[PDB]
Every structure is written in C-alpha cells, then in structure tokens.
Amino acid sequence: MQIFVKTLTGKTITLEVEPSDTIENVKAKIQDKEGIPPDQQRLIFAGKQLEDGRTLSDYNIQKESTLHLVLRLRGG
C-alpha cells in the first residue's frame, strides 16, 4: 500500500509500505528518499505518536493514510 508523509514545510513523501512494516522501517524508508536520519524523525498519525517497534496495522494505518513528520531536535 501507499502512505503519505507530510512535513510542515509542505513537502509530501510517498512511501510504499505494508501493514506489517514497523514504524522503524517507515523511518528508514524516509531516510532512503529524503536523507533524514530516523533518530531525528517523529512520526504522528491522527494526533498520536508512533512507537518504533509497533506496526502500521497496529495504529490501524491503512491505504493512503497521511502521516506527519516532525523533526526531533539536537543539542550541545
């Protein structure tokens, strides 16, 4: 299936995923196309934050659902 990942700059990433994929795999797929390292990625679906070890089907994320990508900050 296809899911959309909308950042807050307006860019929309289109990933080819499966219900059985983990949130970790989604973050890696984002890295493959956008270069964003997963350790700076926060994925949000319908207001709830997505845990790396749970699946898309867990959160009932289905075909053409839209996920939000928030950047996790660094600090020195």
Binding site: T7, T9, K33, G35, Q40, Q49, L71, R72, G75, G76
Partner: protein
C-alpha cells in the same frame, strides 16, 4: 512550577541533562523497583568500570556517590561519561549509520566537493533542519575532514551515475569499502565523541533498557507509563526539568567538589576519589 536545571553545554548536554534527572529519580527511590534489571546492572557495571575508587560495587554505593557529589556539575562529571559508555553498548547498526552520513555528504555536496570547497562551506543541514552527517563533522579538520574531501574528490571522478541519494548509496557501498571502514575506526575512537551533539533517540536503546522515557519540550506520550526525564531544548542546548520538591532534596545539596574538565572526565585519566 517546575524548576529548569541548567546543564553544561559541552556538546554533551543531552548526557549531562539526563544524568541530573536520572540522579533525582535514583536518589528519590522511585527507580528502586528497577535496580535489579539487566539495564541497571549494566549501568552499575559501567559506573564501576569508570570509577576505580568506586567500591563496593552496588547501588548502595552509587547512591552515596551521587549524594556526596550532589552538585549538578559534579553529577555531570561522574555520571554523564558513564551514561555515554553505557550508550555505546546499544549501538547495533553503526556501520550503516556511517554509510548514511557519507552518502548525505556526497549527495548534497557533490559539486561543492569537486570544486574544492572548505568543510565549513558545506551544506550540513537538510530541508527540515536535520543534521546530515554529525559524526563526520566531529572528526578533526586537519587530520580527518580535509583529507576526506580530498579522497572523495578522487572517488567521485568515477561517479558517472545520476545524482540521486539511492545511487550515491549504492555507489559508496561498492566503491568506498576501505574508506568506510577507515571512518569507522576514527569515529569509534574519536576522543571528543561526547561533543558531537545529540538527539534523544540516539539513546533510545539505553533509555528503553533503563525503563526511562525521554520527554522533549513537553511532547509527552500520555500512553507511556514509565518514569519520565523531562528535557528542555531552546538554543540547540539540552536542559532538564525537576520539581522543586525534588530539587531541594536531591540536587545542589553540597558545594562543588570536583575540579576537572569535561574532557578529563570522559577519558577517565583524572580519578574521582571515593566519598568522604
């Protein structure tokens, strides 16, 4: 109503801040239920391996150390390097992490590298503000960074493919095998690794194993029922939040006792003496 405790900004403010907050949870006893878990015994091991005067090796003694050296800066100096070393034990996919840094460098700076642009003139951030190759930025300029651009200019002379990130990735896996292993040596043995700059998730394996959740700028998952270290980040710096009822009981009880630099702390050469 929650006090913001300032952590030192030595590049390791994430570790410094987590140290202070994890200390309050330890001295408060709220983590006593988790002190016989694999993750906390691993921490006890790493605390003993860093402090040669730390004896007997037990959570009793480690609590006493944090109460003797109750100043937040002393706490940073004795605990932050311990959480740093413990954190290195949970980095399962690091070979791949470097491959992604080097491909970000080449993908976003191919023209810049071929034109002989200095390291500071590079594009090191992405469209969302992310850091593209923070581990490589941290290596020494004269010994590591400037030579890297020199040998990348050479390897890219064979780059006859289109400038996608996918191609750069596959290209580096095939054409830069030795260079990637050479960077693993330098990164793993980087003495100033702690100044690299850090994200919460870079520690997720360790915090998870410590039954601890990291809350960045009050963005808390209400579902998570774990002990929470609440972190604050405003100017690329990590501070920590703590309740006044706890800060007056388990923080800044004593004056500063240690006179050592952060570098001396992480390298463990300068010993911290046993309490009293």
């Amino acid at each position: 109503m929650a006090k913001t405790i300032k952590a030192t900004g030595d590049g390791a403010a994430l570790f410094n801040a987590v140290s202070i907050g994890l200390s309050v949870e330890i001295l408060s006893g709220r983590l006593d239920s988790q002190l016989d878990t694999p993750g906390y015994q691993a921490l006890l091991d790493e605390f003993a391996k860093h402090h040669p005067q730390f004896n007997p090796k037990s959570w009793k003694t480690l609590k006493e150390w944090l109460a003797y050296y109750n100043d937040t800066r002393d706490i940073e100096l004795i605990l932050a390097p311990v959480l740093f070393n413990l954190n290195q034990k949970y980095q399962d996919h690091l070979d791949e992490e470097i491959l992604n840094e080097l491909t970000n460098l080449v993908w976003k700076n191919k023209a810049n590298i071929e034109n002989g642009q200095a390291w500071f003139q590079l594009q090191n951030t992405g469209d969302l503000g992310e850091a593209l190759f923070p581990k490589l930025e941290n290596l020494d300029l004269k010994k590591d960074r400037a030579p890297l651009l020199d040998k990348l200019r050479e390897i890219l002379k064979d780059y006859k493919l289109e400038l996608t990130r996918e191609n750069v990735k596959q290209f580096l896996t095939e054409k830069a095998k030795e260079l990637l292993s050479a960077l693993k040596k330098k990164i793993s043995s980087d003495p100033h690794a702690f100044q690299r700059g850090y994200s919460c998730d870079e520690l997720k394996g360790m915090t998870d194993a410590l039954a601890i959740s990291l809350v960045e700028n009050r963005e808390e998952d209400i579902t998570d029922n774990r002990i929470k270290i609440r972190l604050e980040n405003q100017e690329e710096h990590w501070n920590v939040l703590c309740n006044e009822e706890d800060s007056e009981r388990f923080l800044d009880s004593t004056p500063s006792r240690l006179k050592m630099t952060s570098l001396e702390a992480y390298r463990g050469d300068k010993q911290v003496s046993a309490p009293t």
